[PDB]
Ligand binder design. Structure first.
Ligand SMILES: Cc1ncc(COP(=O)(O)O)c(CN)c1O
Ligand SMILES: Cc1ncc(COP(=O)(O)O)c(CN)c1O
Lengths: 399, 396
């Protein structure tokens, strides 16, 4: 009975959390700070802001950029709701763009056509750990510069559409040897229970090195937005009784605890071997399914080395009904599986805001025959062999 | 002596419970959060409880469940923490601040009446330091102004009046006329932040008192949906609304389950500390807010005191002198209109002079369950001497 995504937690993680629980710092403290430092080294970015979710990280990026009512934010039609929800939270207008025929990525021609005078941010999603075609994306925003008009402080520092990576799945992924985090202008990460790297709940915001961003000043802004808008002046912090503070904006509550950071520090030590195990599982699946009607998204390309978060596959010539039936047959054989994703316009939330599935047929076609197999580091080679064999047999029989 | 203001009280039992969660398959929201909700509902005498990642999340989702938004008004005291008021601006509603009484943190209820309009949807009283507000008076007020109210949402229709939502961040275990906090106001939000009496390092809850016109399961489902991206549901699920991410992990719940077992003895210790302070300061110019009244038995979260005849400058000086003697202290609170955030939205400190007068001479002493009776004795004695000296230097 093979589960889809159980957590891989050892005694080292437990010992580190216990150490936090014997200290005076059980919420944001020295270990969150240390995790930020070490994650910045790993993602090859100057500073990292650890928070309580990727959804928090993604939303604060937008709030730092002061994206708001009147502004537009392009998102793929094929993604998880959290990529798009944050756009509605800040009051901006989501603009969905349909995807390509071979891949989850946005059709970049349609992306170009979708850009307007109101466009402030593109949010590509590094689905399953596979990083998007960023050469193409930066080409597009440069080309469409002068549609852009800066209506905020940080928008002025860039003078173009800002690319913000939804890297929820992509910690440790690379694009042309560069780590995710260091490619897009801003990037958000998830450390949710079911991700490769986890703090049960948690996430981060980072940004690549850019001459027009003071990194300390940018970090201070995230911190302020994450901890109720609280600031202290230099006088108040020097004083022995440092009680006095101001609230500059009526902000949010999404800081990371040293409980979560503890988990993070140990996960990050163990992460390169967890990636290797994930690599070995994917390669064994790839052999197994070669020459079959089961077509996996490629986690190793000319440009990309994926984190290998999700084993997304599509079954050739399978209808919606036939897909649903395969998944149930997989479960009767004790193999959990999933679907990434219903395109956003199938969801009641986005229907209700006027998004219609017929404008994004490639997204629907991706969804129709998609099946995600288990990919985690508690799977054995025998379980992988069984999933391969069963999935091939169950698909044959249904067809 | 170097006495900290609010260190966390964490034992091996809490660590063993978290470790147990870390060996299970459920490291985020799982069976222990569910169990914590159940047990908290029994403790607060409410039917259902929603455990979340902060009181700020709990308070904000209450507002979003009630569909409080642009055009609506929410009354809050001028004397409170920013989190009481921030959530009002987050949903797009308009905050209405009301000044407080001369003797106490509570809103002046005459001014509260006058502040109510056709737009008013919610009053958020704050149970400051664990002291629960005058709810007989508050329900009298909303009932009196009942014709001003019109329900412009589903859950507003269940009440047909202004909804009272308790900011009980400090008040888990407090009671008003024998009733537990949680069971008095229409909705109540709790904080389990590191510095609170009951803690999960970060965490909180929303609950609501028993009301015939609220299906409790249906209300709970709505909170869950808003807390976990709008998801409802065997792969298939729908997202009904583009919602939020504020669920509680079984890591935090673990801490909660053990804290709740230990909580009645932590309250008793806090009771003993407060009583020793009360003796110490009797007949002095140090005037504590009362944690035991005719109506209230406080959780005893904060030992709020005001020093009679101390100016702003003299107060700031006392706090630093307290620190030179190794006694940490704090101020609850700057009135909201002193804060840059609320200044910028047009709130002006001169409309709330009682709130300012409360702030001016307020000093909060340490009240936590790592304090010894010797440390309490030293704080009593020092605070009396440091106040005497600061006033003598000023007269000179
Ligand atoms: C593609 C994508 N984007 C964003 C998120 C947000 O993750 P989190 O729960 O950490 O906010 C997730 C997972 N929830 C995801 O799968
Ligand atoms: C009076 C009051 N209200 C609300 C909050 C918000 O609590 P939390 O940090 O758990 O969101 C706080 C801070 N614990 C507070 O002191």
């Amino acid at each position: 009975n093979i589960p889809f995504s159980p957590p891989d937690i050892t005694e080292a993680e437990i010992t580190e959390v216990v150490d936090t629980l014997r200290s005076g710092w059980i919420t944001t403290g020295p270990k969150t700070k240390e995790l930020e430092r070490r994650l910045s080294l790993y993602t090859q970015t100057p500073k990292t802001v650890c928070l309580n979710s990727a959804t928090a990280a993604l939303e604060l990026i937008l709030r730092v950029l002061e994206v708001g009512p009147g502004d537009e934010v392009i998102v793929p039609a094929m993604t998880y709701t959290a990529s798009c929800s944050v756009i509605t939270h800040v009051g901006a207008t989501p603009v969905m763009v349909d995807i390509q025929a071979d891949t989850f990525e946005m059709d970049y021609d349609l992306l170009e056509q979708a850009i307007t005078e109101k466009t402030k941010v593109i949010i590509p999603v590094e689905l399953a750990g596979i990083v998007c075609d960023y050469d193409r994306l930066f080409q597009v925003v440069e080309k469409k510069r002068d549609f852009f008009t800066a209506s905020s402080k940080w928008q002025k520092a860039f003078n173009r559409i800002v690319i913000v990576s939804d890297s929820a799945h992509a910690l440790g992924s690379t694009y042309k040897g560069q780590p995710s985090g260091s490619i897009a202008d801003f990037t958000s990460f998830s450390f949710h229970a079911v991700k490769n790297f986890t703090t049960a709940e948690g996430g981060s915001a980072t940004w690549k090195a850019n001459p027009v961003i003071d990194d300390e000043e940018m970090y201070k802004e995230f911190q302020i937005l994450s901890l109720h808008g609280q600031t202290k002046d230099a006088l108040a912090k020097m004083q022995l009784g440092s009680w006095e503070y101001d609230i500059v904006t009526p902000a949010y509550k999404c800081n990371m605890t040293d409980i979560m950071a503890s988990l993070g520090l140990v996960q990050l030590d163990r992460y390169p071997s967890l990636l290797q195990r994930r690599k070995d599982i994917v390669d064994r699946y790839d052999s197994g399914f070669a020459g079959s009607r089961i077509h996996p998204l490629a986690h190793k390309t000319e440009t990309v080395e994926s984190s290998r978060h999700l084993y997304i596959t599509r079954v050739e010539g399978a209808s919606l009904e036939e897909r649903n039936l395969i998944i149930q047959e997989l479960a009767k054989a004790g193999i959990a599986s999933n679907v990434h994703y219903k395109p956003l316009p199938l969801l009641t939330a986005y229907k209700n805001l006027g998004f219609d599935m017929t404008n994004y047929p490639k997204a629907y076609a991706f969804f129709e025959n998609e099946i995600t197999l288990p990919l985690h580091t508690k799977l054995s080679d025998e379980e992988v062999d069984y999933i391969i064999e069963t999935f091939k047999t169950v698909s044959e029989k249904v067809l």
